[PDB]
């Protein structure tokens, strides 16, 4: 699906 950028479930962590 989709509901985020992609790099974002990365910078947050």
UniProtKB/Swiss-Prot annotation:
UniProt feature coiled coil, ranges: none
Function: Cathelicidin-like peptide with antimicrobial and hemolytic activities.
Protein name: Tritrpticin
Natural source organism: Sus scrofa (Pig)
Organism phylogeny: Eukaryota, Metazoa, Chordata, Craniata, Vertebrata
Shown part of the complete sequence: 112 to 124 of 212
